[PDB]
Design a protein around this motif. Structure first.
Motif: not given
Ligand code: QCR
Length: 309
Positions: A40-44, A91-92, A140-144
């Protein structure tokens, strides 16, 4: 719809990015000792005690937890101990802005146009849920995978009431170079000011990540907009792509296209991509497939898991 989890169920593995607001980690969900370990990604949140910073990340979490669409990022969970941590899809790849700058040499017209369609679809979804994003931008757009992108970064988003047209914003720091003129002068945001930002985002993509209005200072921007100056035609764009961009930046917000129209128009172009974008070496450009993106991920997870040992 916040799933509040224990902080102890997550191990941080690696730092993926950090800014003033906080840090993004690659983590593992470990709810059962050593038998399940799910990436997972975790924003802290950095400023754990700041009421203004807590307010910001919690508003972000709320908007993010109420979305559900394939071209939009959603909140998997939250931890609320001494600080806030948002739990998100890993995301990769990072953001599309960084992606287009790094992979410029192998990005063809079909990819650029699919990305336009997908972002419009994601924005159409958001409009239908009454969300004004207020910070649409390539960063602000992510690449999956290279074929599949998603809108994220909901810190500035506002949920309009039924049939209400406008959000009147308070004062603060705002991304002037992506904003509609009415947003700069009057602090008014709508779906149609989101359409203005969308046109800037397309322009970032078509220039492979140029900064908009490069040289002109932020405080000069409303002056040049009122005088009629706009972002220049990118080298690869035929006039029909540039006209769509220019329609998004007209003074009258209702004369701007709608997201649903933009999906139809970019879909048409994506059916014959080389007619509409003229890129040198288009037909022999290679980008990783979805299965390559999973390989890359398995590769990275192999070495990161060796690093933790
Ligand atoms: C190389 N891998 C990566 N690299 N960078 C980022 C961030 C820093 C863009 C990643 C971000 C993610 N996942 C998600 C999912 C949904 N939302 C985000 N956020 C949205 C808010 C922003 O503060 C940033 F955290 C990006 N990240 N997965 C992988 C990333």
């Amino acid at each position: 719809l916040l799933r509040i989890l224990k902080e102890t169920e997550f191990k941080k593995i690696k730092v993926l990015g950090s800014g003033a607001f906080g840090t993004v980690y690659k983590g593992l969900w470990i709810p059962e000792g050593e038998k399940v370990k799910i990436p997972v990604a975790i924003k802290e949140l950095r400023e754990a005690t700041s009421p203004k910073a807590n307010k910001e990340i919690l508003d972000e979490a709320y908007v993010m937890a109420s979305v559900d669409n394939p071209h939009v990022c959603r909140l998997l969970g939250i931890c609320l101990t001494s600080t806030v941590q948002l739990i998100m899809q890993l995301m990769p790849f990072g953001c599309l802005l960084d992606y287009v700058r790094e992979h410029k040499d192998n990005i063809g017209s079909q990819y650029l146009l699919n990305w336009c369609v997908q972002i419009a679809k994601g924005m159409n979804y958001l409009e239908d849920r009454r969300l004004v994003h207020r910070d649409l931008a390539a960063r602000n757009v992510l690449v999956k995978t290279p074929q599949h992108v998603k809108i994220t970064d909901f810190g500035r988003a506002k949920l309009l009431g039924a049939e209400e047209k406008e959000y009147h914003a308070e004062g603060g720091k705002v991304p002037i170079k992506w904003m509609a003129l009415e947003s700069i002068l009057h602090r008014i945001y709508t779906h149609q000011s989101d359409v203005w930002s969308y046109g800037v985002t397309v322009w970032e993509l078509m220039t492979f990540g140029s900064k908009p209005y490069d040289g002109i200072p932020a405080s000069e921007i409303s002056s040049i907009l009122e005088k009629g100056e706009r972002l220049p035609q990118p080298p690869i764009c035929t006039i029909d792509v540039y006209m769509i961009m220019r329609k998004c930046w007209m003074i009258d917000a209702d004369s701007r296209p709608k997201f649903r129209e933009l999906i139809i128009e970019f879909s048409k172009m994506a059916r014959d991509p080389q007619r509409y974008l003229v890129i040198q070496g288009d037909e022999r450009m290679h980008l990783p497939s979805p299965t390559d993106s999973n390989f890359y991920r398995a590769l990275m997870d192999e070495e990161d898991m060796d690093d933790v040992v």
